[PDB]
Ligand binder design. Structure first.
Ligand SMILES: CC(C)C[C@@H](CP(=O)(O)[C@@H](N)c1ccccc1)C(=O)O
Ligand SMILES: [Mg+2]
Ligand SMILES: [Zn+2]
Length: 889
């Protein structure tokens, strides 16, 4: 089990200048021929020539057209091809090989594989070695000349990187195409596609050089009508990079291709981006609302990779966050600008603080640049991606837009066409920092700790106001808990965007201010503060930290009502809920432990409920934001604040609090649900796929959130509304009608209705599966068995498997059933899935990530299942490594 260390990076003793590929696709096999034009590098010390090559069937190997002898001149163990140095030339030479591979039976979906009737590759991170021999690491830059041949009837459309320079017929109903891609690239950016693809296309003209760029979006013929939004998003992405960053696309053509079987969301292969169909295809009739922001972000993300990933590349995989964190940040700026809704930024924070904070306090905790790895496939984490994006976003907060764009331009200008490391980016920002501070001695050396230090910092506050002096003080402290990566944590450079609200009239008291906390603690003093303010802290969520604001609920309510910053309002509400949750949780826990016959619960704050009512009734307030304030914090956010969490007690706590608020506001909820209908469900542009209205979709989110609250509350006659809702043309609505009907006798009736609506669209059916899986049903285990026997069956499609099982794992009462039956079920699925797709098997482990945070019985139940999984003789390296780290073994 080899461990790779970041400090051990050394350049290869070899060079690969040119790759010439012939990929010959046949019915039962694919033959790959490869000529590598190679050289000896200056770092060479006479070593053996070792290629990566996984699962390759060798027909022959040669050096300079001389066939090599197995055993005497090379060995191959199905992972590494070793050519003994004595047979390696000392100057420029040609290495060639012909191997056989089998996309048809490649169910792991890495390397070359068959998705339905499409042949497609996935090479990031270590997939190219499953196609042919290579020194499979991102610093090996080469030119590519690729020929693909196949049966013309089955695979009429052939695609690879670069320019298609020849097309030709072949005897036997076959045909070929040759693509030449002269610019250097790492092998993980190579891609090929063959299939019966249909397309939409458009011509984009670049802003500055006026180059015409051909845009193609591809799917199977059945869903070609679902391609329109993707095309619009691509156009939007190119414009944004041009307008914000001044970056134009440099190639003559860009292809997007949707496939049904894909491990993640998408992949940025140069000129040939490949997508999970669920992140490229949509139509108003056959998609839930969520698909529209999803496609916008994933298309945007892959496009922005063209610079941050494809033109400036990684030296080694340890720099992953430099392309992933930076590209997520670029995608976030894009989406906020495109949606023009505050819920876009709130949704990313909601994700970070639930899922990534959980990871960062688990045994899997790591910095966004790890010091080591065993499995590259487990390196792609919410930490590297989403905390990475927050660290990338803090440069913009610190510098402001103008100097940030200057720093970013320095980075692209200085590293375009080269490999780079996280340090190169910090250096570029530092130059901006210098300029901004008008001080050549300013540096961002401390900033680098954001890359190396794991764990979530805690930032806490105390305040002082001297009325006679008009002087306000904010005392700030930062603390990161020691963990397995650092025994001693150092103070970070933490930018704290702040405002001061006058509690008397709700007005801003100071101009925009970012506090630069660089010590363990500091005191920030403000003069000429006319009245005691309420501090608006970490506006926009300006650092990825635990915020402990030490405000009263009265203060949080005033912020919630009157603050200008969406995140601080949302967070003040979040904090009011958390105080209530912790208090009620302990009251329920104590009653349970002491087996009390009677006890008291502390009611929800009445002025809080009044403030929620005030905001809901404000016709000028945002519907998206409203839906957040009537929702309790996520379970996986809550668990960060509770030791030995008893999931049953938390379920009871949430139920009490929702009932408390509903007892007061249900009439308001119903009234809004009714009044929102006309605007929310407007059908005016239902048949225009380029017309996407994010505010309107937020109005549906609010209606659907309210309907759920009303249904759980058993509001009088709400079943009437539920049944009418099931008749809506919008899938977000009629799938919502399915899950809220769970609390009624009509459920299986709507189950059958919505199934029939969903079954003839692959992606819609998967959304149906998710809805069923997430249904709040007492018979949920029997329902899941029904899904297995009747719908899922033996599908190896990762979208199907994830649809059936993952939403269910968020069922707090039922997945965590004290028998452990839920843990047993998911473990069976993980072990089953691991036989053909280790990557997705590891994704399916996600519910276990909080295992040591639960009550001691559930900890033991989960640990038992993970140890059972670890004991499987056939367990993959991928899953084994993950569970070993997760169980601290
Ligand atoms: C935030 C998502 C939209 C990003 C994608 C994957 P990616 O675009 O970062 C690509 N680089 C990749 C592909 C396959 C394996 C590893 C990495 C995702 O996770 O869905
Ligand atoms: Mg299918
Ligand atoms: Zn990416």
């Amino acid at each position: 089990p080899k461990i790779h260390y970041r400090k051990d990076y050394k350049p290869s003793g070899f060079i690969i200048n040119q790759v010439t590929l012939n990929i010959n696709i046949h019915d039962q096999e694919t033959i790959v021929r490869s000529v590598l034009d190679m050289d000896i590098s200056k770092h060479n010390v006479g070593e053996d020539l070792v290629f990566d090559g996984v699962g390759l069937k060798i027909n022959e190997i040669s050096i300079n057209n001389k066939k090599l002898v197995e055993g005497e001149e090379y060995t191959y163990d199905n992972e590494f091809l070793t050519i003994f140095s004595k047979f390696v030339p000392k100057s420029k030479f040609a290495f060639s090989s012909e191997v056989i591979i089998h996309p048809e039976t490649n169910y792991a979906l890495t390397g070359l594989y068959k998705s339905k009737n499409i042949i497609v590759s996935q090479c990031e991170a270590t997939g190219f070695r499953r196609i042919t021999f290579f020194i499979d690491r991102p610093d090996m830059m080469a030119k590519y000349d690729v020929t693909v041949t196949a049966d013309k009837e089955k695979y009429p459309v052939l695609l690879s990187n670069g320019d298609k320079v020849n097309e030709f017929e072949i005897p036997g109903g076959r045909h070929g195409a040759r693509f030449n891609d002269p610019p250097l690239k790492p092998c993980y950016l190579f891609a090929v596609v063959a299939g019966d693809l249909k397309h939409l296309s458009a011509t984009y003209i670049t802003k500055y050089t006026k180059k015409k760029v051909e845009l193609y979006v591809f799917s199977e013929e059945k869903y070609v009508s679902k391609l329109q939004w993707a095309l619009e998003c691509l156009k939007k992405s190119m414009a944004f990079d041009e307008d914000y960053f001044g970056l134009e696309y440099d190639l003559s053509r860009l292809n997007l291709v949707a496939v049904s079987d894909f491990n993640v969301g998408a992949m940025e292969n140069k000129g040939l981006n490949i997508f999970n169909a669920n992140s490229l295809l949509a139509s108003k009739k056959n998609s839930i609302d969520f698909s529209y922001a999803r496609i916008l972000t994933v298309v945007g993300h892959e496009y922005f990779h063209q610079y941050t990933g494809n033109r400036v590349t990684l030296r080694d995989w340890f720099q992953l966050t430099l392309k992933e964190g930076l590209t997520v940040h670029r995608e976030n700026l894009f989406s906020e600008e495109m949606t023009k809704t505050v819920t876009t930024r709130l949704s990313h924070v909601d994700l970070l603080r639930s899922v990534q904070f959980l990871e960062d306090s688990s045994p899997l905790s790591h910095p966004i640049r790890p010091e080591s790895y065993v499995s590259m496939e487990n390196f792609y984490t919410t930490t590297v991606y989403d905390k990475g994006s927050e660290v990338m976003r803090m440069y913009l907060t610190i510098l402001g837009e103008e100097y940030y764009k200057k720093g970013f331009d320095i980075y692209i200008k200085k590293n375009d066409g080269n490999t780079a490391t996280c340090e190169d980016f910090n250096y570029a920002m530092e130059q901006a920092y210098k300029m901004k501070k008008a001080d050549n001695s300013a540096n961002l050396n401390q900033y680098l700790l954001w890359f190396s230090q794991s764990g979530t910092p805690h930032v806490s506050f105390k305040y002082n106001y001297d009325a006679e002096k008009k002087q306000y003080s904010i005392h700030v402290n930062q603390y990161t808990k020691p963990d397995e990566n650092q025994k001693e944590k150092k103070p970070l450079f933490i930018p704290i965007s702040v405002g001061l609200i006058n509690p008397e009239n709700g007005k801003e008291m100071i101009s925009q201010t970012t506090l630069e906390l660089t010590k363990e603690s500091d005191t920030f003093v403000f003069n000429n503060i006319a009245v005691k303010p309420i501090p608006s802290l970490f506006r926009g969520f300006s650092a990825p930290v635990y915020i402990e604001d030490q405000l009263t609920d009265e203060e949080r309510i005033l912020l919630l009502k009157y603050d200008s910053d969406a995140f601080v309002r949302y967070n003040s509400c979040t904090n009011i809920y958390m105080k209530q949750i912790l208090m009620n949780y302990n009251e329920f826990l104590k009653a349970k432990n002491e087996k009390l016959e009677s006890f008291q619960l502390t009611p929800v704050n009445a002025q809080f409920i009044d403030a929620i009512k005030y905001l809901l009734e404000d016709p000028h307030a945002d519907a998206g934001f409203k839906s957040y304030i009537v929702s309790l914090p996520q379970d996986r956010y809550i668990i960060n604040f509770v030791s030995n969490l008893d999931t049953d007690v938390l379920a009871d706590t949430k139920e009490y609090i929702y009932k408390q608020i509903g007892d007061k506001l249900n009439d308001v909820y119903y009234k809004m649900f009714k009044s929102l209908e006309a605007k929310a469900d407007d059908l005016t542009y239902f048949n225009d796929e380029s017309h996407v209205d994010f505010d309107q979709m937020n109005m549906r989110t609010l209606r659907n959130t309210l309907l759920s609250l009303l249904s759980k509350a058993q509001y009088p006659n709400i079943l009437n509304e539920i049944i009418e809702h099931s008749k809506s043309p919008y899938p977000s609505n009629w799938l919502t009608s399915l899950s809220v009907s769970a609390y009624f006798d009509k459920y299986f009736e709507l189950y059958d209705k919505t199934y029939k609506l969903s079954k003839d669209d692959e992606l819609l059916l998967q959304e149906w599966l998710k809805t069923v899986s997430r249904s709040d049903r007492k018979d949920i285990y029997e329902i899941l068995k029904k899904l297995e026997n009747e719908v899922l069956k033996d599908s190896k499609n990762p979208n199907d498997i994830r649809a059936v099982y993952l939403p269910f794992t968020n069922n707090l009462r039922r997945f965590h059933d004290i028998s452990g039956k839920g843990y047993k079920l998911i473990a069976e699925v993980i072990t089953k899935t691991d036989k053909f797709n280790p990557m997705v098997a590891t994704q399916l482990c996600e519910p276990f990530k909080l295992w040591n945070k639960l009550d001691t019985k559930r900890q033991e139940l989960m640990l038992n299942e993970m140890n059972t999984m670890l004991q499987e003789p056939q367990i993959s390296n991928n899953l084994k490594e993950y569970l070993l780290r997760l169980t601290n073994k």
